[PDB]
């Protein structure tokens, strides 16, 4: 998946730093909101699988 290539490549582009965790933390939320956009609030389980996968 492109997600793994992005994981390795941004690990390279991010390791220079010393606090990548929060950067990724904020990076998560736009995905949260986009997902709220594409799918309803009765689909919380698929929301949870996308949570877990990302």
């Amino acid at each position: 998946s492109p997600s793994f290539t992005e994981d390795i490549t941004l690990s390279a582009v991010m390791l220079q730093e010393e606090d990548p965790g929060e950067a990724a933390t904020m990076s998560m939320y736009p995905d949260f909101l986009k997902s709220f956009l594409e799918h309803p609030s009765s689909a919380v389980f698929e929301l949870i699988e996308q949570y877990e996968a990302t």
Binding site: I8, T9, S11, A12, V13, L15, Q16, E17, E18
Partner: protein, 48 residues
């Protein structure tokens, strides 16, 4: 057959590293240097 059927027999890949830059800091009086650096200070002072 695995590659033709989207299967695999195991694979691996990652990404490399790039330059990271770090340093130290000083202190006055009760200072951040060492006795090592103080002995060095004598030497370079007399040298200069």
């Amino acid at each position: 057959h695995t590659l033709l059927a989207s299967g695999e027999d195991a694979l691996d890949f990652t990404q490399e590293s790039e330059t990271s830059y770090i340093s130290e800091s000083g202190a006055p009086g009760r200072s951040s240097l060492d006795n090592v650096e103080m002995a060095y200070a004598r030497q370079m002072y007399m040298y200069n």
